[PDB]
Protein backbone atom coordinates (compact mmCIF):
# COMPACT_ATOMS: atom_id res chain seq x y z
CA UNK A 1 0.00 0.00 0.00
CA UNK A 2 0.84 3.66 -0.38
CA UNK A 3 0.35 6.14 2.45
CA UNK A 4 0.85 9.82 1.65
CA UNK A 5 0.89 12.25 4.59
CA UNK A 6 0.68 16.04 4.28
CA UNK A 7 1.82 17.95 7.35
CA UNK A 8 2.94 21.46 8.22
CA UNK A 9 6.60 22.34 8.05
CA UNK A 10 8.35 22.56 11.44
CA UNK A 11 9.34 19.08 12.61
CA UNK A 12 12.96 18.03 12.97
CA UNK A 13 14.41 15.43 10.59
CA UNK A 14 14.63 12.94 13.51
CA UNK A 15 10.94 13.38 14.37
CA UNK A 16 9.86 12.97 10.75
CA UNK A 17 11.90 9.74 10.37
CA UNK A 18 10.27 8.44 13.56
CA UNK A 19 6.85 9.39 12.11
CA UNK A 20 7.56 7.35 8.95
CA UNK A 21 8.75 4.40 11.01
CA UNK A 22 5.57 4.59 13.12
CA UNK A 23 3.26 4.86 10.09
CA UNK A 24 4.88 1.68 8.73
CA UNK A 25 4.43 -0.02 12.11
CA UNK A 26 0.70 0.88 12.50
CA UNK A 27 -0.14 -0.04 8.88
CA UNK A 28 1.53 -3.40 9.42
CA UNK A 29 -0.36 -4.00 12.69
CA UNK A 30 -3.86 -3.05 11.57
CA UNK A 31 -4.21 -4.10 7.91
CA UNK A 32 -1.44 -6.71 8.10
CA UNK A 33 0.78 -5.52 5.28
CA UNK A 34 4.42 -6.65 5.43
CA UNK A 35 6.78 -3.71 6.00
CA UNK A 36 8.42 -4.84 2.69
CA UNK A 37 5.28 -3.76 0.75
CA UNK A 38 4.48 -0.55 2.61
CA UNK A 39 5.33 2.75 0.92
CA UNK A 40 5.19 6.09 2.78
CA UNK A 41 5.50 9.67 1.42
CA UNK A 42 5.72 12.60 3.82
CA UNK A 43 5.22 16.03 2.34
CA UNK A 44 5.56 19.28 4.30
CA UNK A 45 3.73 22.51 3.50
CA UNK A 46 3.53 26.09 4.74
CA UNK A 47 0.53 26.66 6.97
CA UNK A 48 -0.74 29.29 4.54
CA UNK A 49 -1.11 26.56 1.83
CA UNK A 50 -3.50 24.38 3.90
CA UNK A 51 -7.08 24.85 5.05
CA UNK A 52 -8.17 22.45 7.81
CA UNK A 53 -11.98 22.41 8.26
CA UNK A 54 -12.64 25.56 6.18
CA UNK A 55 -10.22 27.61 8.30
CA UNK A 56 -7.83 30.13 6.85
CA UNK A 57 -4.44 30.30 8.56
Amino acid sequence: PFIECHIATGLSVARKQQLIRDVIDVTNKSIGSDPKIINVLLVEHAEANMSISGRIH
Binding site: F2, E4, R15, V26, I31
Partner: protein, 58 residues
Protein backbone atom coordinates in the same frame (compact mmCIF):
# COMPACT_ATOMS: atom_id res chain seq x y z
CA UNK B 1 -2.91 17.47 8.10
CA UNK B 2 -4.21 15.14 5.34
CA UNK B 3 -3.51 11.40 5.08
CA UNK B 4 -4.44 9.04 2.24
CA UNK B 5 -3.91 5.29 1.87
CA UNK B 6 -4.15 3.60 -1.53
CA UNK B 7 -4.63 -0.15 -1.13
CA UNK B 8 -6.30 -3.28 -2.43
CA UNK B 9 -9.93 -4.13 -1.70
CA UNK B 10 -10.62 -6.62 1.06
CA UNK B 11 -9.86 -5.00 4.42
CA UNK B 12 -12.62 -5.44 7.01
CA UNK B 13 -14.42 -2.45 8.60
CA UNK B 14 -12.61 -3.43 11.82
CA UNK B 15 -9.22 -3.23 10.02
CA UNK B 16 -10.04 0.20 8.48
CA UNK B 17 -11.09 1.53 11.91
CA UNK B 18 -7.79 0.26 13.40
CA UNK B 19 -5.90 1.87 10.49
CA UNK B 20 -7.52 5.29 10.73
CA UNK B 21 -7.22 5.31 14.57
CA UNK B 22 -3.51 4.17 14.47
CA UNK B 23 -2.66 6.72 11.72
CA UNK B 24 -4.48 9.69 13.34
CA UNK B 25 -2.83 8.89 16.68
CA UNK B 26 0.72 8.87 15.34
CA UNK B 27 0.23 11.97 13.12
CA UNK B 28 -1.46 13.82 16.01
CA UNK B 29 1.43 12.96 18.39
CA UNK B 30 4.10 13.86 15.82
CA UNK B 31 2.54 17.20 14.76
CA UNK B 32 0.86 18.35 17.99
CA UNK B 33 -2.34 18.68 15.96
CA UNK B 34 -5.65 17.33 17.39
CA UNK B 35 -7.14 14.24 15.68
CA UNK B 36 -9.98 16.44 14.35
CA UNK B 37 -7.40 18.42 12.36
CA UNK B 38 -6.40 15.32 10.40
CA UNK B 39 -8.31 14.31 7.24
CA UNK B 40 -8.01 10.64 6.22
CA UNK B 41 -9.10 8.81 3.05
CA UNK B 42 -8.68 5.18 1.99
CA UNK B 43 -8.76 4.65 -1.79
CA UNK B 44 -9.27 1.07 -2.90
CA UNK B 45 -8.57 -0.77 -6.14
CA UNK B 46 -8.30 -4.22 -7.60
CA UNK B 47 -5.01 -6.12 -7.98
CA UNK B 48 -4.26 -5.18 -11.64
CA UNK B 49 -4.26 -1.48 -10.58
CA UNK B 50 -1.30 -1.92 -8.20
CA UNK B 51 2.32 -2.60 -9.16
CA UNK B 52 4.53 -3.48 -6.18
CA UNK B 53 8.10 -4.79 -6.43
CA UNK B 54 7.67 -4.40 -10.19
CA UNK B 55 4.75 -6.85 -10.55
CA UNK B 56 0.99 -6.31 -10.81
CA UNK B 57 -0.88 -7.65 -7.77
CA UNK B 58 -3.26 -10.65 -7.84
Amino acid sequence: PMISCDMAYGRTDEQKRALSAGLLRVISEATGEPRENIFFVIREGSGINFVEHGEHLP
